[PDB]
Amino acid sequence: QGTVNWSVEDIVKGINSNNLESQLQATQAARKLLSREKQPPIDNIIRAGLIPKFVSFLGKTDCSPIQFESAWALTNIASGTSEQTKAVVDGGAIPAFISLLASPHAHISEQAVWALGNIAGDGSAFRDLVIKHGAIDPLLALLAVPDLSTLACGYLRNLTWTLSNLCRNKNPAPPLDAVEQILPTLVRLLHHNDPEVLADSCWAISYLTDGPNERIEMVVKKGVVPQLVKLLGATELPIVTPALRAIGNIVTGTDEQTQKVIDAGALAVFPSLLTNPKTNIQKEATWTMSNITAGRQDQIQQVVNHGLVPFLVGVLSKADFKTQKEAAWAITNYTSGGTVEQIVYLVHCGIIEPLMNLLSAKDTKIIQVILDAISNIFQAAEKLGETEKLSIMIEECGGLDKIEALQRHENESVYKASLNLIEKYFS
């Protein structure tokens, strides 16, 4: 292979030669230049004006090697900044790649899938432009096989990643018709036995579930929540992270969607998620819990039945401070929407000491959340003639001191609520 380490000048000489095979050699040399991880000369290749020549090569049926080489080079040009991807798009590459998707050579169609994914990954605009050119139909036609296992592993992984990029990005979100067109194949991929396919499919579902309740409902109608929970229980963290993200997105919708999550058995997995060694898994699991303790009282009772209140107490006691803030949110929602029996159970699980210990943080929001939770618990106690007991409890663990110190805190509502508590339950 004497196509190693050409100069941009030599490649330009070869591509302008009007000799199909000299052009093929120059295009392979360009591909190898662009395939180096140490600063590929993308900008230099663009300034040479080579993108139109590559795009024209994309359509040379009688020379599949130059098709593959130009597709690879343009894929690696589109893998760069938004301006480089834009240079690829302006050359007319989208329709050429969509036409290549029907190539009878598997590696060329795979490279076209790769390039289209790189393009759509730039953002909403290029995503929707790829959709408008009619990519979804051929992309999904490539997956129209009885058993996904017959497809090549890398082929299927690239197809899944591209389809996931077609579901990515918001403001705007993907077209509803496109999501309806993709979701069946996406579910079939979500039921695949390959870990990377599963991770990309869960990321796609997490993208689709990040939005209004209508999108969440589109996703939930397809009965993917049970599979999402099964994957939530997986050992491969790359699969668990997107599955937890998707469950947390779904529980932000209506209480019926949250209830479908609960029915699928998600809570049973949360004892592990809330003690996960990954800080972000813990944080997102606590964030998901906060969106469940905000729901109905029967759902709070489901949380309690699964014995997850001790795990929230633990997270509040020792965890990354952001996880602790999400836990404070969950506790405040619990107390605001829960019964008196449930608030009493929360206090019995040992919430008061770790809740007080967080009133010395420098985050003003967590102070407000904790004070709101304390006010709710004190209301629940008033409903029992137990305010004296709870005040004694908060005093014996050093909480009264922090509450008093919060009267000089700069923020307004902070000292307002703290002074209210001081004057109302401590006299």
């Binding site: 180096r36 894929t75 790769w114 994914g117 990954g121």
Partner: peptide, 7 residues
């Protein structure tokens, strides 16, 4: 977002 193809 994007993925470069390496040799």
């Amino acid at each position: 977002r994007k993925r470069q193809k390496l040799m």
